[PDB]
């Protein structure tokens with residue numbers, strides 16, 4: 001594919017003193033727009049955005065039994081009170097229940113995990129660093145361009161997984177719905193390797209058009225985290241995606 | 243499962259001077275409640291709620307290719323301006339584009355439509371009145387209890403159709419996404435036989451519970467139509483669900 005710089009987008013980043021990139025593609029990833037050619041292809045830890053491939057692989061390997069799977073809490077202490085409860089797949093995504101996804105990865109195992117990430121062309125495809133933490137502090141890395149390519153394949157049911165499993169994950173990623181406007185999206189925040197990276201990736205359907213998007217930025221402190229959503233939203237609104 | 247009458251929910255009807263029924267079922271306990279057992283079993287034209295089985299049968303039969311199909315507007319005037327445009331499958335369901343679904347029903351044909359409504363146990367299964375209007379002014383009738391049974395079967399993929407097609411229709415029905423819950427739903431308004439009936443049917447997923455719902459009411463005039471959503475929302479708010 002082909003990626004074209006929109007210089008007018010930078011004002012959005014400089015105004016807040018952000019180093020970041022936004023990639024946005026209408027209809028397909030054949031042709032994408034960005035504020036920064038270089039950074040659009042730079043690879044970073046996925047952090048919780050990896051919950052998207054992880055869920056697909058969990059379903060594809062039968063570790064997650066089906067769409068109605070309940071991840072049962074055994075009652076032993078977890079790090080966050082929001083995690084101390086039985087969860088659905090969507091629930092685990094909404095509360096960012098890392099430990100649920102860790103147990104999924106352990107059950108998938110390194111051999112199967114490595115195979116699906118290569119079939120999915122998922123970032124640098126490197127799962128070194130321990131089966132439960134490679135996407136949090138190991139060697140895996142992916143770019144904003146690669147995230148849009150991956151999400152486009154998921155939208156099209158073109159990943160190397162059943163259509164049923166791709167539909168199941170897609171439903172769990174819906175974050176906004178209206179009669180002719182539907183958003184699928186996912187945040188991430190990588191804090192374990194410097195610089196810290198904030199993500200927001202997804203796609204938007206508006207009438208009969210679709211737009212795939214991925215945003216990342218350097219995160220100085222937690223107070224900057226809302227810009228992950230507000231900068232990309234402002235740019236998308238500038239394209240009439242409202 | 244079970245059903246119990248709960249006449250307290252009558253507060254909301256008597257306030258608004260409405261004759262109608264709500265049926266709300268908790269999946270895990272297999273238990274339903276209703277303000278009115280008799281009306282819960284009365285059977286009415288499904289009107290636009292028929293878009294749910296019709297979409298499923300459309301896909302099952304190959305009439306609808308998949309969830310990416312776009313139904314193009316041919317430029318002829320439509321009963322609602324909001325219909326005068328190309329629509330996706332989700333968009334055609336959510337704006338209730340009757341002309342789109344009449345065309346689907348024509349291509350499905352009488353033999354196939356009958357076969358499916360029998361498999362789905364859908365209301366009285368009577369498709370007399372003409373293959374493109376039987377659900378709007380013909381002989382077809384369904385009760386609130388029947389609607390919740392049907393929606394539970396869809397949820398569980400137990401309809402006689404592929405899991406893939408059931409899932410496609412499930413995502414098309416999403417109407418509200420919140421952190422704590424996801425609502426799938428569909429409105430209807432039956433105007434071609436008196437008295438006029440307003441419907442709202444669907445389900446709410448919250449925590450690891452699922453609640454199926456069906457609401458209908460006599461509509462005295464267009465100005466009452468919001469009550470189709472507002473009375474059931476108020477009850478579900480009282481019940482701590484949404």
Ligand SMILES: C[C@@H](O)[C@@H](C(=O)O)[C@@H]1NC(C(=O)O)=C(S[C@@H]2CN[C@H](CNC(N)(O)O)C2)[C@@H]1C
Pocket residue numbers: 047048049096097098186187188189190222225226
């Ligand atoms: C739980 C943690 O290990 C991460 C994970 O891998 O899921 C969490 N994932 C995310 C995320 O955004 O997806 C986070 S952000 C952190 C918890 N939620 C807060 C949201 N901050 C704000 N202000 O932007 O809403 C701050 C956490 C770091």
Ligand SMILES: [Cl-]
Pocket residue numbers: 133136
């Ligand atoms: Cl950890």
